[PDB]
């Protein structure tokens, strides 16, 4: 088993530290469902990005191997180009010999430059890695450096120390009852059929059933912006001037759970889970968001419902397994 523990940057981003090479160099990354390439800012950025955050230095560790395979890859928060290498890359006890990486050379656009993490490390299916890249968790399998092809999440609420990626087991004590099996829809990403989304008994979004990733690269539940709009007058959000949804924070005192049925199974949402209270105000955790390009119309459940649900990855029966925590 490999324990990755993560940190919980102000209950937005959660990231963990890899080392890449021999010395190993430090890194921090995301550990993220919804892509599967993991990259570096390498030494060959110049980028404001790059400035700010830890560079690989290819020169200065023993075991690297270069390659002439670039890597472009376009994200939602904007796009990344890299040359792809091999290193031995310590991550949660294991190390990972030989693993494929990208070095990045460009990294547009501030979202990255105010991003408290270096790099991205994905989980989801080698399909939707760019390049071919071998991901991670899948290098550690063909190597056996794992005893079961499966990795575990716990997200922690409140700002507390403790999320972690259990690699290759699963820490039964993390939740409640029992797991609850359900199937993939496409191999790509996590992808699950949804059955409905329900406030009071009526259905409020998934009338005949949609589809969702599960994915920790995500603060938010998204969903497209149509059903969003339905969901966000329901639970009582307005337009802020600035453009934020705000809600009243006495609506967690008065609100019902929102009920979200994967395969059978009735999983809530409860208010103090979907409606944030910042320093700020409270707002929704609901976002407005649609589809990328190469998919049908998807709902991501994001952080918002991780959080309150011990998730499993199972790649040797291509299942996600869910249980409330604690």
Known sequence: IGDEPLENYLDTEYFGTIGIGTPAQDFTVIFDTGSSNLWV?????????????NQFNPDDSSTFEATSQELSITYGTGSMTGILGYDTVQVGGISDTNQIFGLSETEPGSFLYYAPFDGILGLAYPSISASGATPVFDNLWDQGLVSQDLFSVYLSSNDDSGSVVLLGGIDSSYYTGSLNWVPVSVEGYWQITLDSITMDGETIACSGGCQA??????????????????????????????????????????????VFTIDGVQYPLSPSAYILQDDDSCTSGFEGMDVPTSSGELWILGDVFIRQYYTVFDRANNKVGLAPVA
């Open 41 to 53: 800012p390498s030494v060959y950025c110049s980028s404001l990005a790059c400035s700010d955050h």
């Open 213 to 258: 990733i599960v994915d920790t690269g995500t603060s938010l539940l998204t969903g497209p912006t149509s059903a969003i709009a339905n969901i966000q007058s329901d639970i009582g959000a307005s337009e802020n001037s600035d453009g934020e949804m705000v809600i009243s924070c006495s609506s967690i005192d008065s609100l019902p759970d929102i």
